[PDB]
Amino acid sequence: MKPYQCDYCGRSFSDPTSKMRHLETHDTDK
């Protein structure tokens, strides 16, 4: 078991897919 957590969020995603979208769409400054 290894939680796919976000380095900035501290939130553990149990799925690499949504942890992926969440990490790439984190780039929503504009």
Residue 20 engages Zn ion in binding (rule: CB under 5 A): no
Give the closest residue to 1 by CA, choosing from 14, 20, 10, 11. Answer: 14
Question: Could you say whether residue 9 binds Zn ion (CB under 5 A)?
Answer: yes
Q: Decide if residue 6 touches Zn ion (CB under 5 A).
A: yes
Output the smallest distance, CB 1 to Zn ion, in A.
20
| Tokens matching residue 1 | 């078991």
Number of residues interacting with Zn ion: please give it, by CB under 5 A: 2
Residues sharing a CB contact under 8 Å with residue 30, sequence separation 6 or more, in sequence order: none
Interface contacts to Zn ion, rule CB under 5 A: 6, 9
